[PDB]
Ligand SMILES: C[C@H](CC(=O)O)S(=O)(=O)c1ccc(Cl)cc1
């Protein structure tokens with residue numbers, strides 16, 4: 403297991419760790435999170451009690467360094483840092499653990515939820531979407547725009563998702579206009595999978611990351627990207643059978659985890675009806691269709 | 703965007719523009735079969751591509767062979783229209799290329815946009831105007847050229863004859879849409895109005911009779927009266 407200690411908690415804040423969350427009171431003796439399962443990425447996220455503006459947070463992997471949190475009263479936020487003195491870090495943590503000033507990451511042993519949401523998500527691929535090379539961890543917040551959003555504006559602080567545009571020359575081969583516009587298989591299989599992503603695992607990782615950014619930070623740019631990558635698959639007549647099966651699992655766990663009270667803003671009615679009921683893969687998403695129909699029949 | 707009376711000169715700004723009507727591209731007759739089923743048979747059609755300012759009409763004839771062995775013909779017809787318009791633009795010298803293409807039906811927007819991706823500065827737009835260009839086939843010399851064609855073929859016309867010598871394009875387009883609306887509403891009566899007087903003839907290089915200014919006023923009155931008559935017959939007014 404691994405640990406993210408906090409120097410202190412000087413402002414009241416709701417802290418999230420993956421899909422879990424808890425409240426810390428102003429100057430309460432909180433010194434971080436322990437028993438974090440090694441082997442997956444994680445995200446620690448914040449929403450200040452006195453200013454719900456700016457959800458923000460940090461994607462990290464405890465195998466790539468020792469990270470702690472410290473409040474910066476100038477920039478007004480909880481910042482992730484890396485401690486390079488390992489023995490110092492171990493000494494600090496043991497003291498906080500001995501004094502039981504840390505919350506335990508609350509993993510139920512029947513529960514595969516976080517594995518199922520992050521199966522294909524890899525810290526090295528996150529750091530190419532979120533460009534801040536001098537850190538081993540990656541900051542994301544509510545307001546960061548995507549490269550595509552900044553085409554339709556500080557490029558250093560953007561989300562470099564792969565741009566998907568069904569009416570672009572990249573999606574449409576000259577001489578195959580009707581064919582490629584009504585059937586996206588060329589764009590999916592040659593341009594995106596063979597060309598840009600190299601394999602389906604990297605495509606699903608970007609997809610999963612887009613969903614998690616949208617749900618944990620209320621990032622509109624991420625929500626757009628998630629839906630675009632789903633629609634690109636569903637709108638293709640020719641998709642490997644292994645991809646369709648795995649996509650049904652991916653979406654099933656995302657719908658299952660979405661807070662019901664946020665469904666109105668996190669699910670695009672148009673895109674989901676097309677994918678489930680009109681598209682080439684209308685019949686290929688049995689588990690996702692069933693949970694969507696039992697949980698969010700209003701959207702349909 | 704899409705257009706209105708809130709600019710009655712924005713569709714008419716100063717840019718080369720074309721109106722593209724696809725109604726008459728895919729045309730069929732429906733008939734019973736020997737076994738009592740129903741079958742279609744296609745007939746020749748045409749794309750109506752018109753410049754409002756000059757009156758130049760690029761009539762692309764759609765020969766039935768285009769459809770042989772093809773499926774989902776109503777959908778293909780929109781994509782074939784888009785392809786032929788795109789090929790027309792590419793055939794024109796750059797200074798003759800349009801700055802705006804205006805489709806009479808919204809279903810043509812995506813097919814024409816996708817075909818024209820290589821021309822990002824040409825705006826593709828719809829219109830709220832209800833233009834009667836489907837009645838182009840009621841014009842005898844255009845119907846004749848479409849139905850005699852044995853192969854794909856493009857034919858150029860000036861749909862305003864020599865009118866621009868005497869009137870503005872605003873007035874010529876007005877006259878044209880009133881003539882086509884009347885032919886769409888009561889074809890026989892409209893044609894009776896246009897031909898009745900045999901001392902007024904259609905020049906061999908024209909589509910419409912050689913009316914004087916005063917006769918056109920009279921003819922325009924009779925077209926407004928026919929449209930009103932038919933509105934009355936329709937609604938019992
Ligand atoms: C779409 C509206 C926001 C916007 O247009 O930026 S919203 O508030 O419903 C929304 C906000 C965040 C997300 Cl993750 C999805 C939707």
Ligand SMILES: C[C@H](CC(=O)O)S(=O)(=O)c1ccc(Cl)cc1
Nearest residue numbers: 710875876877879880883922926
């Ligand atoms: C019948 C009228 C003209 C006429 O009666 O002389 S109209 O309905 O065609 C018309 C409609 C829109 C415009 Cl931009 C111009 C004329």
